[PDB]
Design a protein around this ligand. Structure first.
Ligand SMILES: [Cl-]
Ligand SMILES: [Cl-]
Ligand SMILES: [Cl-]
Ligand SMILES: [Cl-]
Ligand SMILES: [Cl-]
Ligand SMILES: [Cl-]
Ligand SMILES: [Cl-]
Ligand SMILES: [Cl-]
Ligand SMILES: [K+]
Ligand SMILES: [K+]
Ligand SMILES: [K+]
Ligand SMILES: [K+]
Lengths: 230, 204, 219, 199, 213, 238, 233, 216, 244
């Protein structure tokens, strides 16, 4: 028999800073690098999927996940916490569709998912999520890219990077990224930003990449990743 | 019948880049009439209207509770509601009371924001959506309204002619119903304007 | 409402009419009684229209969620069980009699499920108000391993039988063909009745209607 | 519905008919009313179709877990108790009689009747609407220690006669035989069906 | 459907005097046209000063007496004294009313002594309306016992009778006579008559045989 | 110490200090003695006064017609356990119509007293009881503690200076089984006498006695009802 | 930091022992059980002449035959007093009689250690009551006086004092008590001892006096009546 | 239970010198239909008390396991205490009334025979909570048929030997088989004594049909 | 062996070296209690417990450490006796639930499995403390044969031919290894159980003791019960005279 704690594990310090959120921000900042780019006619999301051993089955688990027909997810930080947010976001997407009979606007999903992240910064007996989410989507004939973080705050991006070397990844994108890209060009600059922080040689198994357009969201097959790696 | 208690008649029609919605103005309890200027058509935004026929309390309740959910939608979303989305919102609202339903059969009529496209639909008392390219009717004189609409409606009607058709369909169907009347209110919806008219209906 | 399911060599075919009746009067002459559940699984709904719609959409939503977590093509056997248990919980108060058919790793499957929660698996079935007519045709002209084309024709015939013979059945006949390669939904596959023609023009010269009050809001 | 279960030395025989009917109309002339609770345990379905199928599923579920916890094939007695318990907990809410028959190492082939939420073990049991017309038959046609094949004749015969008398019973006869070796499932078509006095 | 009640008959009688209280009842327990048992007295000891008589549905009577028995202990552990005749009567009223919407089909009459030593009789209905009186009958033959007591004990409808105070001897014979008359007419009354006498010395029981048909 | 603030915290030695601290509450209370023969069970307790103007505290409490208790420790915890014992005895008579066997009632104490010792925020019962009862198995003397553990005993003493009474009973434990009721109470009184200091002895105001057995139901004698037992006394020797 | 239900190495509850210490800050109250009645006396402790005299109620009526004197945290007391008043009328409704002074005190003593944190209701007590009470009244066992403290322990008293100067008033009652005292001497003694242990002089508006005797009900003394008992200083 | 399914008819009971004897036929009826003609309606509670039950058989089997567990639970303690025949009767009365008051009754009529402390016990329990003690007991139709026989013999001879009680019971089962349409000629006899509970196997009452020729 | 201050106060807190000390301290409570023993014979299981007499005022048979969980199941406990009785109640209810659900006597392995889950549940949270005792479960039938299981404070359960818990669990196990229990009758086993208790018992540290003994085999028809006074005293004399 058990009964949970009813007191907040995230409190205000004398400085006025919620320490556990910034500590959760350290968990994502130390995780594997991820990059997202909004490119006029579509969105691309890419991440480092280096399992650091040849024993692993690279096909079993995925980091780039679909939420619905038109929305995808990538993360930096902890895998287990990310899974919870995926399952919650998939349910929120269906809850919206059952009520309105319309594919959920990306901005509306991120708002609903970020609100779940907010709970774990105030609710009793729980720690915040150690994950920053990268949400892509297509609705009203327009590409969307969003960032959700442990705080529960959300930001809209043209292009951004998170995880290891997120500071060097962003400055790279400031110079490299230009508006009005083609989707196929966006995959290149996504892998290029990922190469800046890699360490090792890139194979189609070492990285994972998903794309979102007017035809919906899908993860690129290992054969498709190999062709861009040249 | 429970629907027969208060009565009422709501009708919607479709035309060339325009939609029309009309209702009777009667509020009455079984034997007698109380009010001549009762409202049954409610605006759910510019260029989108809902008409509600049935029990007067549930007519007012659904309209108020839908406005509650509509305003929250229009605030959370950064947009004005699409006609298909409103239909699904009413459908969800009514079905939530599956085994204790509001005794009203709603009619959505309006033009799609941005895309100009005309839209008309009617629903069950438990929220079953019905989309047509011509007309939808709801009330105690369903059969009378169906008989008029089937004979009068034409594929491509201009705002001038659509008003005349939807009026005559409402006028004569109401004159055969004992629980509907005391004036007819017609809304003609265009991109440029909205035309509101009360007609010289029978007051008996 | 007349709905039928047929099992053939390459897959399954489902049929429905398009008539929805309120009281003893026709409300919708063109409604969709074949429901999307999974890309390769569809369900035919008869009973309370709202119930069939919502129960179906619920299943479809759950099935998509299942597919997403599983990462695999959903099973029709899974859909059937989901439906049963939900419907059983409500003791037949959710008036949904359904014909669910789909293709699996396990092949093509046809199920029928009743509002009380009973299910049965079979090569062919028909539910709804016009089931008698449809079952009659299938019982008469059904052979196993029918070619798709013969199956298409028989199903149409079976549903057509319901349209003409039944008062609560009418409109066009919709068919959905499910094969391992694909699922082709054919709306208005066949239309027995077309009366567009009217002899009189009931038009009104503007001003015929007497108006007491006019108000215009410009936008 | 006519359902029958007969007990012999090696194991048991469970019989059923193929028809479900809604009033005067038949909705399924080919329905298998023999459901397995476990590898060696079967039950025969009667009553409300929905209720019977609902109980069958739960019984199979609980027994599946029971088996794993014991790491042994469930006793038939155990199987019979779960069904009895579900039927009794909701006697007013659920309308079903399930006959549970199977094989276990401890006590061999066994037959249990759970009608009304009671537990009884019998040399053989009949259930359903059709059972009324064969009460006389079974009393005169029963002999102790019938061989598997004799048991099959017995259940087939009884059900055939019930099917012809009963309006709510018809279709083909479904038969299973449970032994230590395995499960034998066979169907008897109308042409194969036994003949008696018809007129 | 299903009826939660059964009629078991039985009549209970109580009379109050200067220093005594009498509770009397038949020993017949019946159901329909059959007799369950001939040995079922309705009188029951609660304290040395108070006796209860229950009639009607025996299922309710058994449960109610057991509740009172438990409530008597609960009171004496909390108040360090025995519950008085008036206090038991006040308690029974609240227990009977707590079942206002699913009542005990029961006719209770309490007989005992007050704090001054004087005889006290409390009459109840199935729901809990009660008062103190000199004499009361309750049950299937209560309408047969009442009018004779109104005439003899209450001196009603009489002109020049000198109004003699009630003695134990006279009341005992009155109790016997009305029950003998009731056993002749009421089918649910018979077998044996048990009389419980409450005095300052305590409870004394007496049995007189009745019609067994 | 930091292993002594909660019942849910085990000491490195393999102990719970909060149970042991609750056991200290029993020792601080005034002494009480329980003993039995083959026919009777007698409880003898020492009443205590905070001041001479205030009356003496209740030590013996009623449970049922066949069961009685003597308390040692916290008053509210004693009354809480007493009400539970009364309720269990009432439930037994309501359902089975027969008195609850002493053995089973004490087992219900053991089950109830255990619950709060294993839950966080809860605490052990700060009272130890001596239970005297009579049933089908004859007379019984039982002992309960803050720790849910209970004992079936021939004679027992708990409270302040109860060791002196414990040693007296241990010498005369073979005497009790053939003892007359009047002789049995005097043995209980003589044990309780050993607990008191040399200056003071048993008086009519500070002695409470409870007796249950084959002859009669549980009865508490306090003031004037106690003097027949005290009279006929062998003088206090050393 | 510890919980509210924590035992000391000594064998006592901390929160209870600390609640006893809260009484040692409250004003002194004295009750005397006479063979012909019970008298209760308490000091009001006036902080300012602006404060209304009859505003402070440290002696209250619970029933027609029961009076109660309070000391310590007054806010906690009136919660217990209302519960005592509810109990008397609940018992009157059920049994058609007046409760004994012992049963009333016992009923209040049941709320004693009914406090805690976990495994409790949303509105359950967090701490004990910082109140000591003197229940004085007349039932069918003659005149009675009872003392109660936060531990729940309640006992009858021939004469008892509780408050800031508890020991000083206890010793003064100890040498000036006969179990055959008259009610005239009873009020006198309580008034004599009260002025000795106080920081302020005895005025007619400074103190409360109450009497419960077999004949008449609980009586709150009026200013004029206090001046007749203070005339005999 | 709102509507009983499989039911059992009259249960008999009469106490002799040094024990009690109970009889009940081995029939479980589904309406008028004789469904199970070899099922036991009597159980042994412990070594002092026994129980025969009328009405719904599923409710009897439920009470059979609850009472069965209670004896098991008591035997585990081994404290020298056991449930007396009166205690079982008292528990059963409280159980039936509790279910009755919840409007969900156990559809049963019980006869409880027992022997303890040299005294014979015979108790009746109804589905509504009606309970009492009698020298002879008969439920259902037995109350109209068998009970008049038992009372008339016990009036002329209050004390019976075990043999006298047995032959009286067999005489009553004969009348019950003749006059009850819901009875059968296969019954059991249970007996409590100083030695304990003894339930005897399938018995048949001797029937005479010579009055079939006395209609001409 | 122990960590102070922080990592040993709660069972919901792991120590740096991956240990739950609250469980380990609860394991110390049983190590302090007197020795409980039990071994599996050819035709059943026999239990034996040394019961240290705290005072001669206590009755002979008080503080029973041998329990009847079910008619066929017996429990032998060592540790905090308060927890032992609650676990005896939990085990009794579990055996009762099995019969109510499945209609026959619970298999001992499953009973041990079920109760061990309840014990384990008290090792995960700060809201509750682990049980401060270890206990043994023994049964016999014609189908399953003789079986013996033991559960400790952590929630671990294993099958045994011979098992001991308490003060001198090591001194007992080495004496059990000497016996050919796979071939021995349970009548012979009782004698050997009694002598190992006497050898294990410390007469110079602990004051005095009583010997508790239990049956569960073919001689008792599969029912768990107490070893009679006649057979026990024969085994006690055997224990005293072979101690030389
Ligand atoms: Cl908390
Ligand atoms: Cl149509
Ligand atoms: Cl049969
Ligand atoms: Cl059946
Ligand atoms: Cl009550
Ligand atoms: Cl104390
Ligand atoms: Cl104080
Ligand atoms: Cl009850
Ligand atoms: K569903
Ligand atoms: K320490
Ligand atoms: K304290
Ligand atoms: K055996």
């Amino acid at each position: 028999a058990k009964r949970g704690y009813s007191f907040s594990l995230t409190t205000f310090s004398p400085s006025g800073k919620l320490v556990q959120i910034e500590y959760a921000l350290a968990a994502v900042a130390g995780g594997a690098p991820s990059v997202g780019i909004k490119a006029a006619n579509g969105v691309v999301l890419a991440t480092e999927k280096k399992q650091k051993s040849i024993l692993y089955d690279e096909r079993s688990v995925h980091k780039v996940e679909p939420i619905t027909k038109h929305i995808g997810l990538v993360y930096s930080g902890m895998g287990p916490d990310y899974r919870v947010l995926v399952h919650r976001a998939r349910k929120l997407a269906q809850q919206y569709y059952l009520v309105y009979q319309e594919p959920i606007p990306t901005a509306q999903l991120v708002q609903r998912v970020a609100s779940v992240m907010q709970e774990y910064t105030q609710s009793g007996g729980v720690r915040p999520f150690g994950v920053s989410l990268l949400i892509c989507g297509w609705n009203e004939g327009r590409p969307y890219l969003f960032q959700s973080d442990p705080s529960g705050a959300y930001f809209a991006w043209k292009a951004t990077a998170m995880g290891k070397n997120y500071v060097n990844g962003k400055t790279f994108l400031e110079k490299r990224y230009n508006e009005d890209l083609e989707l196929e060009d966006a995959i290149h600059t996504a892998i290029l930003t990922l190469k800046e922080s890699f360490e090792g040689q890139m194979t189609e198994d070492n990285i994972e990449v998903g794309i979102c357009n007017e035809a919906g969201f899908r993860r690129l097959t290992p054969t498709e990743v190999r062709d861009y790696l040249a | 019948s429970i629907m027969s208690y208060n009565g009422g008649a709501v009708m919607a029609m479709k035309g060339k880049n325009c939609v029309a919605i009309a209702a009777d103005r009667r509020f009455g309890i079984q034997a007698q009439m109380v009010t001549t200027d009762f409202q049954k058509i409610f605006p759910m935004g510019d260029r989108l209207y809902i008409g509600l026929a049935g029990l007067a309390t549930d007519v007012q309740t659904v309209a108020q509770r839908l406005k509650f959910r509509l305003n929250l939608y229009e605030l959370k979303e950064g947009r004005q509601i699409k006609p298909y989305t409103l239909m699904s919102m009413v459908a969800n609202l009514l079905y939530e009371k599956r085994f204790g339903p509001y005794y009203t059969e709603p009619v959505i009529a309006g033009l799609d924001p941005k895309t100009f496209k005309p839209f008309i639909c009617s629903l069950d008392l438990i929220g079953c959506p019905m989309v047509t390219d011509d007309f939808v009717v709801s009330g105690t004189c369903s059969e009378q309204m169906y008989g008029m609409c089937e004979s009068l409606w034409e594929p491509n009607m201009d705002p001038e002619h659509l008003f005349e058709t939807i009026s005559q369909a409402m006028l004569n169907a109401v004159d055969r119903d004992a629980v509907s009347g005391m004036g007819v209110i017609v809304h003609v919806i265009e991109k440029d304007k909205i035309t509101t008219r009360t007609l010289k209906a029978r007051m008996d | 409402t007349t709905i039928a399911g047929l099992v053939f060599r390459d897959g399954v075919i489902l049929g429905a009419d398009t008539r929805a009746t309120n009281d003893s009067v026709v409300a919708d002459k063109s409604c969709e009684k074949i429901h999307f559940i999974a890309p390769k699984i569809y369900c035919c709904g008869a009973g309370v229209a709202a119930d069939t719609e919502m129960t179906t959409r619920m299943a479809a939503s759950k099935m998509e969620l299942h597919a997403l977590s599983t990462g695999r093509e959903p099973r029709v056997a899974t859909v059937t069980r989901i439906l049963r248990q939900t419907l059983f919980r409500y003791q037949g108060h959710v008036g949904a009699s359904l014909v669910v058919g789909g293709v699996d790793l396990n092949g093509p499957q046809l199920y029928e499920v009743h509002p009380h929660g009973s299910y049965s698996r079979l090569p062919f079935t028909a539910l709804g108000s016009g089931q008698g007519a449809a079952v009659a045709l299938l019982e008469d002209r059904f052979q196993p391993n029918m070619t798709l084309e013969a199956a298409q024709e028989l199903l149409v015939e079976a549903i057509t039988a319901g349209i003409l013979s039944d008062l609560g059945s009418g409109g066009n006949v919709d068919a959905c063909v499910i094969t391992a390669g694909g699922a082709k939904l054919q709306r208005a596959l066949s239309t027995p009745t077309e009366p567009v023609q009217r002899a009189g023009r009931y038009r009104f010269a503007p001003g015929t209607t007497p108006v007491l009050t006019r108000e215009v809001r410009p936008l | 519905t006519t359902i029958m279960a007969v007990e012999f030395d090696g194991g048991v025989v469970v019989g059923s008919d193929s028809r479900v009917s809604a009033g005067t109309a038949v909705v399924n002339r080919v329905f298998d009313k023999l459901s397995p609770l476990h590898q060696r345990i079967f039950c025969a379905l009667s009553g409300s179709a929905a209720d019977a199928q609902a109980i069958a599923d739960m019984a199979a579920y609980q027994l599946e877990l029971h088996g794993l916890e014991l790491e042994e094939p469930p006793l038939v007695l155990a199987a019979a108790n779960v069904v009895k318990n579900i039927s009794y907990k909701y006697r007013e809410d659920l309308l079903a009689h399930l006959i549970v028959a199977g094989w276990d190492q401890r006590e061999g082939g066994q037959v249990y009747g759970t009608m009304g939420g009671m537990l009884i073990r019998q040399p053989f049991t009949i259930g359903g609407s059709g059972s009324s017309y064969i009460y006389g038959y079974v009393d005169a046609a029963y002999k102790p220690g019938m061989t598997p094949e004799e048991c099959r004749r017995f259940t087939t015969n009884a059900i055939t006669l019930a099917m012809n008398r009963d309006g709510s019973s018809g279709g083909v006869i479904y038969l299973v035989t449970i032994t230590a070796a395995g499960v034998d499932h066979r169907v008897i078509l109308g042409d194969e069906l036994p003949k008696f006095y018809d007129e | 459907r299903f009826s939660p009640y059964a009629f078991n008959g039985g009549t209970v009688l109580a009379i109050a005097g200067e220093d005594f209280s009498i509770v009397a009842s038949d020993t017949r327990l019946s159901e329909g046209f059959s007799i369950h048992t001939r040995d079922s007295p309705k009188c029951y000891k609660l304290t040395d000063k108070t006796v209860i008589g229950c009639s009607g549905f025996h299922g309710d009577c058994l449960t109610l007496t057991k509740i009172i028995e438990a409530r008597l202990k609960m009171y004496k552990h909390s108040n360090n004294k025995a519950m008085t005749t008036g206090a038991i009567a006040a308690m029974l009223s609240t227990i009977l009313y707590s079942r206002r919407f699913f009542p005990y089909y029961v006719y209770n009459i309490i007989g005992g002594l007050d704090e001054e030593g004087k005889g006290a009789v409390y009459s109840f209905d199935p729901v809990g309306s009660y008062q103190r009186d000199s004499f009361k009958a309750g049950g299937s033959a209560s309408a047969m016992l009442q009018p004779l007591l109104d005439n003899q004990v209450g001196f009603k409808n009489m002109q020049n009778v000198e109004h003699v105070p009630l003695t134990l001897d006279r009341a005992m014979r009155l109790v016997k006579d009305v029950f003998i008359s009731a056993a002749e007419r009421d089918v649910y009354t018979g077998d044996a008559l048990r009389i419980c006498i409450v005095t300052k010395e305590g409870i004394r029981e007496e049995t007189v045989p009745l019609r067994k048909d | 110490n930091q292993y002594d603030n909660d019942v849910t915290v085990w000491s490195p030695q393999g102990r719970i200090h909060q149970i042991e601290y609750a056991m200290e509450a029993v020792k601080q209370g005034s002494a009480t003695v329980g003993l039995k023969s083959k026919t009777h069970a007698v409880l003898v307790a020492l009443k205590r006064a905070q001041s001479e103007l205030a009356a003496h505290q209740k030590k013996i409490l009623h449970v049922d017609n066949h069961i009685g208790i003597s308390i040692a420790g916290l008053t509210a915890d004693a009354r809480l356990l007493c009400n539970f014992m009364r309720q269990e005895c009432l439930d037994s008579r309501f359902v089975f119509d027969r008195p609850l066997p002493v053995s089973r009632l004490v087992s219900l104490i053991g089950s109830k007293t255990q619950i709060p010792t294993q839950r966080y925020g809860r605490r052990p019962y700060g009272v130890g009881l001596l239970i005297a009862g009579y049933d089908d198995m004859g007379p019984h003397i039982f002992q309960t503690c803050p720790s849910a553990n209970y004992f079936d005993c021939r004679a027992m003493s708990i409270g302040a200076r109860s060791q002196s009474a414990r040693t007296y009973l241990e010498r005369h434990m073979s005497e009790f089984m053939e003892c007359n009721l009047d002789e049995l109470v005097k043995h209980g009184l003589r044990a309780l006498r050993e607990t008191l200091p040399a200056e003071q002895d048993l008086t009519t105001k500070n002695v409470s006695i409870g007796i249950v057995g084959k002859d009669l139901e549980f009865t508490i004698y306090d003031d004037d009802d106690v003097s027949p037992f005290l009279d006929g006394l062998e003088e206090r020797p050393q | 930091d510890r919980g509210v239900n924590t035992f000391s190495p000594e064998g006592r509850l901390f929160q209870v022992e600390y609640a006893i210490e809260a009484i040692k800050l409250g004003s002194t109250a004295i009750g005397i059980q006479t063979s012909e009645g019970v008298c209760l006396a308490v000091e009001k402790r006036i902080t300012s002449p602006l404060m209304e005299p009859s505003s402070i109620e440290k002696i209250v009526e619970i029933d027609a035959h029961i009076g109660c004197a309070m000391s310590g945290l007054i806010a906690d007391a009136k919660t217990l007093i209302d519960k005592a008043r509810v109990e008397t009328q609940n018992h009157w409704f059920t049994y058609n009689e007046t409760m004994t002074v012992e049963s009333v005190t016992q009923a209040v003593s049941n709320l004693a250690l009914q406090f805690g944190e976990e495994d409790a209701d949303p509105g359950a007590m967090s701490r004990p009551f910082g109140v000591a009470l003197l229940f004085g009244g007349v039932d069918e066992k003659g005149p009675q006086l009872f003392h109660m403290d936060p531990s729940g322990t309640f006992v009858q008293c021939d004469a008892r004092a509780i408050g800031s100067a508890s020991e000083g008033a206890q010793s003064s009652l100890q040498e000036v008590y006969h179990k055959s005292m008259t009610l005239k001497e009873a009020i006198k003694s309580s008034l004599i001892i009260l002025k000795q242990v106080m920081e302020e002089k005895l005025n007619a508006t400074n103190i409360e006096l109450a009497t419960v005797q077999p004949g008449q009900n609980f009586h709150m003394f009026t200013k004029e009546e206090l001046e007749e008992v203070i005339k005999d200083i | 239970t709102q509507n009983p399914m499989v039911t059992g008819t009259s249960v008999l009971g009469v106490k002799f010198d040094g024990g009690v004897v109970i009889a009940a036929d081995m029939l479980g009826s589904y309406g008028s239909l004789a469904r199970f003609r070899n099922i036991s309606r009597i159980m042994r509670v412990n070594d002092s008390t026994m129980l025969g039950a009328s009405g719904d058989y599923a409710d009897f089997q439920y009470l059979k396991q609850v009472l069965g567990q209670m004896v098991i639970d008591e035997e585990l303690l081994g404290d020298g205490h056991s449930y007396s025949p009166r205690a079982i009767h008292s528990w059963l009365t409280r159980a039936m009334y509790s279910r009755r008051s919840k409007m969900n009754p156990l559809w049963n009529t019980m006869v409880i025979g027992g022997y303890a402390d040299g005294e014979s016990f015979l108790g009746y329990v109804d589905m509504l909570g009606v309970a009492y003690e009698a020298p002879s007991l008969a439920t259902g139709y037995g109350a109209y048929l068998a009970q008049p026989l038992l009372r008339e013999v016990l009036e002329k001879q209050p004390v019976l030997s075990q043999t006298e009680a047995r032959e009286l019971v067999e005489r009553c089962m004969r009348v019950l088989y003749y006059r009850d349409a819901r009875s059968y000629n296969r019954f059991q006899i249970a007996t409590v004594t100083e030695k304990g509970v003894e339930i005897e196997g399938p018995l048949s009452a001797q029937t005479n049909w010579d009055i079939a020729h006395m209609i001409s | 062996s122990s960590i102070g201050t922080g990592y040993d106060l709660s069972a919901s807190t792991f120590s740096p070296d991956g240990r739950v000390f609250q469980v380990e301290y609860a394991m110390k409570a049983v190590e302090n209690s007197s020795t409980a023993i039990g071994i599996r014979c050819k035709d059943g299981v026999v239990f034996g417990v040394e019961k240290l007499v705290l005072s001669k005022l206590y009755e002979e048979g008080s503080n029973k450490r041998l329990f009847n969980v079910d008619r066929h199941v017996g429990m032998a406990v060592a540790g905090l006796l308060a927890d032992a009785r609650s676990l005896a109640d939990i085990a009794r209810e579990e055996a009762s639930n099995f019969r109510s659900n499945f209609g026959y006597n619970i298999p001992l392995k499953h009973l041990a499995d079920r109760v061990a889950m309840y014990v384990h549940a008290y090792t995960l949270y700060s809201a509750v403390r682990p049980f401060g005792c270890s206990f043994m479960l023994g049964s016999y039938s014609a189908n399953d044969g003789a079986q013996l299981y033991m559960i400790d404070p952590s929630g671990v359960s294993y099958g045994y031919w011979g098992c001991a818990i308490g003060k001198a669990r090591q001194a007992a196990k080495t004496e059990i290894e000497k016996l050919q229990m796979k071939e021995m009758t349970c009548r012979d086993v009782v004698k050997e159980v009694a002598k190992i208790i006497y050898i294990v018992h410390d007469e110079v540290k602990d004051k005095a003791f009583e010997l508790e003994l239990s049956w569960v085999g073919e001689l008792t028809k599969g029912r768990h019960e107490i070893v009679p006074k006649d057979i026990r005293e024969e085994a006690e004399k055997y224990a005293k005279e072979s101690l030389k």
